[PDB]
Amino acid sequence: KDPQGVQRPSPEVYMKLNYKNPATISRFLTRTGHMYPADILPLNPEAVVKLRVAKAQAIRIGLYPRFGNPFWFRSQKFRPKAYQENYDPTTYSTKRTVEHFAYNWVQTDRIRRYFRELEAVHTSGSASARGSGGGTTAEHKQQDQFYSPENQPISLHRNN
Amino acid sequence: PSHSGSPVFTQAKLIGLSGEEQLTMCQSETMALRLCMAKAGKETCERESRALDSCLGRVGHLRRAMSEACWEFNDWFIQNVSDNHTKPFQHRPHDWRHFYAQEKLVRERQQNGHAYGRRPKQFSFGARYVKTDGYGKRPRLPYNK
Amino acid sequence: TLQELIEADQILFSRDLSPLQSAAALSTLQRHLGELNYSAWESMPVIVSNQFSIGDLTGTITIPWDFTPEQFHSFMAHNEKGVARCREVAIQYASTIEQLIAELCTALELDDILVSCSHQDALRLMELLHRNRELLIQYGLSKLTLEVGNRHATRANGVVIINCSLTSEQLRPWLKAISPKLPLQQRLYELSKQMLESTLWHLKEFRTMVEPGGVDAFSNDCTYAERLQWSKELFRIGPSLAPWDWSEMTFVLSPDVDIDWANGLLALPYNFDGDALVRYVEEVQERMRHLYRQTNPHMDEYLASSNSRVDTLPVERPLSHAVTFNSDAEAEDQLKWEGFYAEPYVDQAPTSDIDDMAHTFM
Amino acid sequence: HGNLFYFREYPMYPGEYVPAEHNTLSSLRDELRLDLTAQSLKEAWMRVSGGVYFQSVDEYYASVDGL
Amino acid sequence: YMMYHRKAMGTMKYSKWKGAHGGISHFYGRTPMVEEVRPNEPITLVDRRIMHYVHHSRLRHFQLFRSYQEKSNSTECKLREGEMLRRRWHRRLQKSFIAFMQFKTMKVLEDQARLVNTYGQAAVNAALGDPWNATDNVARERKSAAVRRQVRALPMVNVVPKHVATMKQIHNDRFNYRWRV
Amino acid sequence: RRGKPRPRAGMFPDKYRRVPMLLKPQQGGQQYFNHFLIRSTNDRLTQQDVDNASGQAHSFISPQLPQMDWRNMSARSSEESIREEMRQLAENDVMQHQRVFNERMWYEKEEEHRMKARSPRVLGGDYFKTRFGYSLVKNSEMTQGPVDYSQLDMWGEMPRYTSDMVFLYLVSRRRNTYAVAYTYEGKRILNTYTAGNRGLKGGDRGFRSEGSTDNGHQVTSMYLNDLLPKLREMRASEGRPMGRGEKVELVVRVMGFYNGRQGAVRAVQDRANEFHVRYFEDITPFPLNGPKMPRGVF
Amino acid sequence: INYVPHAQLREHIDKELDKYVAGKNEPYPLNFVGQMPFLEDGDGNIVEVPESLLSNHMAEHPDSTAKPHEPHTSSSISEAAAFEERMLRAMV
């Protein structure tokens, strides 16, 4: 909705974005002390000019280091967090979407597998309850009642 | 498929299959197996192997589903996302000559309409501090000289 | 050194021997028997007895009273292999105990788990806690130092004490009973930690400023408030006692004031008048080599290395690897640097040949 | 067995809504619904008859073997 | 010589390193990253995460590219604009893939709804692992413990690509054997 | 072949393409199938008998009649029952984002429940309009009330230094890697150990593995193992001798983005048996705009 | 807003310098960077250092005595907090 970049920061952050406070400067500054490119973090033009002039003043006076930020860890709370558990529709990355797609597909596969194994268990139990002779038909007892690749085969693979 | 007139060199990177940006799954069991096999112990951890295999048995089906989904995405992309090598490329600086021409026009209009596509002269590393009095230290516009 | 064991009382001394004779043996041993002990018998307690014997309880041996250094060296050389085995098993026991404590402390996000009972039963308790780890997370037992003892009780410093003998059915009522007392324990523990670091800093600053012979505030069982007050008073009076040198005397905490001048002792209470103390101060104003060669034939063919000066040939010490891995990434790094994921191929032609071909082509 | 990884519920798409009067969170320990609906009957069948399902009445008759 | 120059910090008989080290040092004000290493967090993993950050941020690329060799301002602008345009085009391409994956997720959700319709809501919850057999609190506590251990999120950083030292180093930020203009 | 590499076995067709699938492998032992099936039936019958002895293998049907529940029907027909049913209906009619049962949702709600277990006149619109500051408080998104000084001090994240820690510089270059160790005052304890100093530079794997992690690991490990006795003797001469097996406090400072960094840090961790690392820092002179570098080929 | 006059310049300067005198019964005001700098006594001598900078202060130059400054605890704001803190101190 704001591709150009004039949405952030907040007006109070504009007010507080001064040379005296490095905490707010480190919010929109990389770990090494460089400014984020507009492709990554599209700040307002007013925001970027304020940030660069404040950084220059702070470096000249001595309030800010020439490289790095002493508030990178403390600014993480202000920095938005893309939780893996909670999906965001407008994510930049496609992996954060394919993981949720895989999660839903695995849930559906779990449903299908659970019901199919329950069906197999119930059929085996009913056959056992009715009896081997009573339950199995003559054709199954005559032909299907032997070892086969489908019925308890030996290991069909080498290097066992 | 050729988005914006440029063919897609690889579509497997988008999926993440056989690439660095893979998906982490059953990381707890993988960590347990790695720790068990790293420790000296007394025997090979076939139990941890069985746990990991039971966890990852459906990985093959998931990969098949994602591969067929990728094929369907390729079909839809060929259907209507691209132009099949029809439109000019938009991924190189010399395909955006108009934007830089506008930049040069702005600079020229700023500098009294004299110098077009001209940059200020290079200055020494300590030019503003080692040059003596009477010599220009801060570089000027190409028109100002 | 040798006085550290006596001061810490970790050294075990059987009392079946005569008092005066034992005192004489201690007096002569602290003078001449101290040197030959290597840097492992401090961790491995020796039992004084009538005759020398290696074995019995794991990691401990018995040395006889009234023992000459020559006979001690002869006995060590004779039972060189046995002493080495005892040292190895003791080190293995210590490493296993530390690893067992760490695998629980890191998992539970605690600080320290101390023990005071049998380690074999402590292992049972710790493996029970490892099995029931997530129930502790469900409850409010976190970021608390633990002690393993015999009596179910909690200490006022913030730590809690758990009995070694505890089962699964008896654990849940114990957790439900101790749950209401947990929030107090955390605040007590954090306040105790802050006061302890403050008083340790005060003591080290007192040592740096006054340059005395020693400061001892942990000898007596006194509360943290008293200890902090005493440390602050000492730090305050440090500048006033600066012109005088106190390296001959040791400052110690005691409920009674005692100033010795023939001896170097100053015992002070937690609430003492520093200005009054300053006023008081103002008012005052070969065979062995042959034996080793015969008994062990490896020393004559293996060289040693000096621990102080760098020898002309540097030999790398064996590297140490973590016995526990917190992360799968750490385990993978361990395998990679152990070479588990290395191709079993053996190099026959180096990349230098390819590089030389490239250079010649250029 | 469980699941490879656990995520929260997917965001609701525009125009998507759970059907009215449908209890999306109904466990098997819950009380039997008094109404006679397809969902209630399927839940009751699962609860009292096990996990036996059939895609058709012909399948049920084949399983029952000639009734 | 600049600190990032090729012949910087050289070890020679006549070469004496500039600046004071230790405590308050030459890098005291110029250190970009400082991390307090703590027990149970290996320094190898700390370095791995730092290198992964500086690589995925495309910052070591610029550092090496500007440090090792001299490149004209025209060349740097050309490379940066090409990178920006390629990144924008790749974002445009990936938006379509994200949309199609969302559509496939909708199809999967519709199939899940079909399964719900054909099996019953309670049956589907039980298949999803509803604690309907948790007669006592311990039964649900076991699954709570399982999911509690699964929630634990290990660092997702991966191994950084190696640096390839090609002959004459036409490109210095080169990390793969693929040839580039 | 004709002066060519021999193709891999995958290119060759199946070595056993001329044998039936039943031969590979053979499924002999058919005579045992009936015997094992009868044995399985017998033991299953025995287990069923054991289970029946344990409990009861009986099932019955309850013939319920519809007229009996007229009391329930009359109770439900009451106004109060309809009212409470409609209250429940209205409560559940709100927007629901829970499609099916979710383990994440169940775990989160149970965790919140267990955390809970462990633990006049309303202001008017005119008042809100006249209170301009309250409007800013509504969307301030800034800390309100007491604030910890840990988020205000600018040296909290900065390292805490002591006079005893030894600073170990690990420099990694394109074709070289070296480690040096200084004290707090800046004295160089031991001579620098570079790849050329130790001989790794200019040998096999030339121009490729000179800056690799292997050479860096080797040089750093050798430097540490040579420095340790040198550091011990330097402290002993200085008059603050090392304790009985004390951990030497090490401050790692690494520079360079080449391959001679992972090997260095791995060597430090492998030698951490005595070198107790307390702080880790990386230093890099990021170029903004400086003197012209030597010209590249391009 | 009152500008500093020439006549009262020395009094204003003395008050500004004595704003940090390492001893008070009230909390010290924060600087323009919201930090608690070193508490200095008369005649320009650093005598108190905050615990955050204490280690660096003692490492840069040894044998420089400086008691670690502790902010004045708030008791007038809420009496119950004062009683709770005193009870915690007693319980250690």
The three-state (H, E, C) secondary structure of F28-86, written as one string: CCCHHHHHHHHHHHHHHHHHHHHHHHHCCCCCCCCCCCHHHHHHHHHHHCCHHHHHHHH
Q: Name every residue whose Cβ is closer than 8 Å to that of residue C297 and which is 6 or more positions away in sequence.
A: none
- CB contacts of D1 in chain B (<8 Å) are 54-55
Query: How many Å apart are CA G53 and CA G50, to the nearest integer?
Result: 6
The pair of structure tokens assigned to C86 is: 């005892």
Strand-pair partners of C54: C61
The SS3 call for residue F140 is coil
Give me the residue from F153, F162, F184 closest to G52, CB to CB: F153
- CB contacts of G67 in chain C (<8 Å) are 235
CB pairs under 8 A between A and G: 5
C-beta of residue E83 within 8 angstroms of C-beta of residue E180: no
Residue that the structure tokens 């060296």 belong to: C73
C-beta of residue C109 within 8 angstroms of C-beta of residue C150: no
Residue that the structure tokens 């002269």 belong to: B121
Please give, rounded to a whole number of angstroms, the shortest distance from the CA of E39 to a CA of chain C.
Answer: 9
Radius of gyration of chain A from its Cα atoms, rounded to whole angstroms: 32
CB pairs under 8 A between D and E: 49
CA E62 centroid distance within chain: 16
Walk across the sheet containing C53-54 and list its strands. Answer: C46-49, C61-64, C53-54
C-beta of residue E7 within 8 angstroms of C-beta of residue F296: no
Residue A21 touches chain G, beta carbons under 8 Å? yes
Residue A73 Ramachandran class (φ > 0 left, ψ -120 to 50 alpha, else beta): alpha
Q: B interface mutation test: which of C328, C336, C337 has the most B CBs within 10 A?
A: C328
Using CA of residue E21, residue E23, residue E25, residue E31, what is the dihedral sign? positive
CA-nearest of E144, E146, E147 to E134 is E144
Residue A59 touches chain G, beta carbons under 8 Å? no
Please give, rounded to a whole number of angstroms, the shortest distance from the CA of C193 to a CA of chain F.
Answer: 18
Taking each continuous run of H as one helix and of E as one strand, the counts in chain E are 5, 1
Query: How many Å apart are CA A124 and CA A122, to the nearest integer?
Result: 5
Radius of gyration of chain C from its Cα atoms, rounded to whole angstroms: 28
The pair of structure tokens assigned to F122 is: 């309303």
Phi, psi of A80 (to 5 degrees): -65, 145
CB pairs under 8 A between D and F: 33
Query: How many Å apart are CA F226 and CA F14, to the nearest integer?
Result: 60
Using CA of residue E108, residue E113, residue E116, residue E118, what is the dihedral sign? negative
Half-sphere exposure of C188 (CA within 13 A, CB side): 19
The pair of structure tokens assigned to F24 is: 């590979």
Angle, helices C328-338 vs F262-270, to 10°: value is: 90
Q: Flag if C238 and G91 touch (Cβ within 8 Å).
A: no
Residue G52 touches chain F, beta carbons under 8 Å? yes
Query: How many Å apart are CA A69 and CA F187, to the nearest integer?
Result: 29
Residue that the structure tokens 């191929």 belong to: C345
C-beta of residue C230 within 8 angstroms of C-beta of residue C253: yes
- CB contacts of A34 in chain F (<8 Å) are 286
Give the method used.
Answer: cryo-EM
The SS3 call for residue C146 is strand
Using CA of residue C337, residue C342, residue C348, residue C352, what is the dihedral sign? negative
Q: Flag if E148 and C333 touch (Cβ within 8 Å).
A: no
Quickly list H helices, chain F: 31-54, 70-76, 79-92, 103-118, 125-130, 132-138, 195-198, 213-238, 262-270
CA E178 centroid distance within chain: 21
Query: How many Å apart are CA C28 and CA C145, to the nearest integer?
Result: 42
The SS3 call for residue D19 is coil
Give me the residue from E39, E45, E145 closest to C327, CB to CB: E45
Neighbours of E164 (CB within 10 A): 14
Query: How many Å apart are CA B81 and CA A94, to the nearest integer?
Result: 17
C-alpha pair distances (Å), F180 with each of C350, E21, E30, F174: 30, 11, 19, 18
Exposure b/e, D17-50, CB count within 10 A at least 16 = b: ebeeeebbbbbbeeeeeeeeeebbebbeebbeee
CA G90 centroid distance within chain: 26
Say which amino acid occupies C17. L
Angle at E112 between CA B75 and CA A120, to 5 degrees: 110
Q: Flag if E92 and B4 touch (Cβ within 8 Å).
A: yes
- End-to-end CA separation in angstroms for chain G: 49
Query: How many Å apart are CA F156 and CA A71, to the nearest integer?
Result: 9
Query: How many Å apart are CA E104 and CA B74, to the nearest integer?
Result: 13
Query: How many Å apart are CA E168 and CA E150, to the nearest integer?
Result: 49
Residue that the structure tokens 């460089």 belong to: A34
C-beta of residue F230 within 8 angstroms of C-beta of residue F197: no
CA-nearest of E102, E110, E95 to B69 is E102
Residue B98 Ramachandran class (φ > 0 left, ψ -120 to 50 alpha, else beta): alpha
Taking each continuous run of H as one helix and of E as one strand, the counts in chain C are 13, 11
- CB contacts of C135 in chain E (<8 Å) are 141, 145
- CB contacts of B27 in chain D (<8 Å) are 5
Residue that the structure tokens 């600049």 belong to: E2
- State yes or no: chains A and C have 3 or more CB pairs below 8 A: no
C-beta of residue C165 within 8 angstroms of C-beta of residue C178: no
CA-nearest of E28, E6, E53 to F283 is E28
The SS3 call for residue C149 is strand
Exposure b/e, A30-51, CB count within 10 A at least 16 = b: bbbbbeeeeeebbbbeebbebb
- CB contacts of D23 in chain F (<8 Å) are 92
- State yes or no: chains A and G have 3 or more CB pairs below 8 A: yes
Query: How many Å apart are CA F284 and CA F254, to the nearest integer?
Result: 9
Residue A41 touches chain G, beta carbons under 8 Å? no
Pairing type for strands F177-182 and F275-283 reads unpaired
Query: How many Å apart are CA C103 and CA C121, to the nearest integer?
Result: 17
Listing DSSP states for chain B in one string gives: -EETTEE-S-SHHHHTTTSSS----SHHHHHHHHHHHHS--SS--HHHHHHHHHHHTTHHHHHHHHHHHHHHHHHHHHHHT--SS-SPP-SSGGG-HHHHHHHHHHHHHHTTTT-SS--PPP--TTHHHHS-TTS--S---TTT-
C-beta of residue B92 within 8 angstroms of C-beta of residue B4: no
| Window 2-31 of B, Cβ < 8 Å to A | 14-16, 21, 23
Give me the residue from B24, B54, B59 closest to D1, CB to CB: B54
- End-to-end CA separation in angstroms for chain A: 60
Please give, rounded to a whole number of angstroms, the shortest distance from the CA of C107 to a CA of chain B.
Answer: 14
CA B78 centroid distance within chain: 23
Exposure b/e, C26-59, CB count within 10 A at least 16 = b: eeebeeebeeebeeebbebbbebeeebebeeeeb
C-beta of residue F85 within 8 angstroms of C-beta of residue F91: no
Q: Flag if G91 and C156 touch (Cβ within 8 Å).
A: yes
Query: How many Å apart are CA C300 and CA E87, to the nearest integer?
Result: 70
Residue B119 touches chain E, beta carbons under 8 Å? yes
Query: How many Å apart are CA C231 and CA C246, to the nearest integer?
Result: 17
CA-nearest of F175, F189, F201 to F256 is F175
Which residues does a gap of C–N over 2.5 Å follow in chain C? 285
C-alpha pair distances (Å), B77 with each of A155, B81, C259, E106, G2: 44, 5, 94, 18, 72
Q: Name every residue whose Cβ is closer than 8 Å to that of residue E131 and which is 6 or more positions away in sequence.
A: D27, E139, E140, E143, F106
Using CA of residue D29, residue D35, residue D40, residue D46, what is the dihedral sign? positive
Give me the residue from F27, F37, F104 closest to A153, CB to CB: F27
Is residue F297 packed enough to be buried (19+ CB in 10 Å), middle (13-18) or exposed (0-12)?
A: exposed
Query: How many Å apart are CA C48 and CA C13, to the nearest integer?
Result: 5
Residue E111 touches chain F, beta carbons under 8 Å? no
C-alpha pair distances (Å), D64 with each of A118, A121, A127, D52: 17, 16, 11, 12
- CB contacts of A107 in chain E (<8 Å) are 112, 128
Query: How many Å apart are CA G61 and CA F184, to the nearest integer?
Result: 11
C-beta of residue C70 within 8 angstroms of C-beta of residue C61: no
Q: Name every residue whose Cβ is closer than 8 Å to that of residue C135 and which is 6 or more positions away in sequence.
A: C171, C172, C175, E141, E145
C-beta of residue F276 within 8 angstroms of C-beta of residue F248: yes
Radius of gyration of chain G from its Cα atoms, rounded to whole angstroms: 17
Query: How many Å apart are CA G18 and CA G27, to the nearest integer?
Result: 14
Q: Flag if D7 and A122 touch (Cβ within 8 Å).
A: no
C-alpha pair distances (Å), B31 with each of B51, C251, C325, G18: 12, 53, 9, 60
Give me the residue from A12, A67, A145 closest to F33, CB to CB: A145
Angle at B61 between CA B36 and CA B33, to 5 degrees: 0
C-beta of residue F295 within 8 angstroms of C-beta of residue E70: yes
CA-nearest of F238, F236, F227 to F189 is F227
Please give, rounded to a whole number of angstroms, the shortest distance from the CA of B48 to a CA of chain D.
Answer: 14
Using CA of residue C243, residue C244, residue C250, residue C256, what is the dihedral sign? negative
Q: Closest chain D residue to A115 measured between Cα atoms?
A: D51
Residue that the structure tokens 């296993």 belong to: C96
The pair of structure tokens assigned to C200 is: 């340790």
